[PDB]
Amino acid sequence: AMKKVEDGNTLVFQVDIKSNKHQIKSAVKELYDVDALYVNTLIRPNGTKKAYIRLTSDYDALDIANRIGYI
């Protein structure tokens, strides 16, 4: 997941199973003030939903990861 944070400027999040790509896009905008280029979603074998969120060129996904504080 962290290789995606660096190379493709895409953030990977665990997301609620009931939420759609419109709600995920809104949530990251309200929490972290960031614009998503797209939201690709996926339900994992363990039953949780994974979202690949690519940010627009205005944002550097690595900077956001440091801001959240997990890299």
Binding site: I43, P45, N46, G47
Partner: protein
């Protein structure tokens, strides 16, 4: 199959989570009687129910 329903796929997720070995710190509890997980399941040996 590759083409599976959501209701099927959610049951297969629980079957994986129920197939774990016993966490080892559980054997340290006082008056503990569980020595191992007695509900293991192999895919080839015992089939589910979907």
């Amino acid at each position: 199959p590759s083409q599976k329903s959501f209701r099927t796929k959610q049951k297969l997720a629980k079957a994986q989570k129920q197939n774990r070995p016993l966490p080892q710190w559980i054997r340290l509890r006082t008056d503990n009687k569980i020595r191992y997980n007695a509900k293991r399941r192999h895919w080839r040996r015992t089939k589910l129910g979907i």
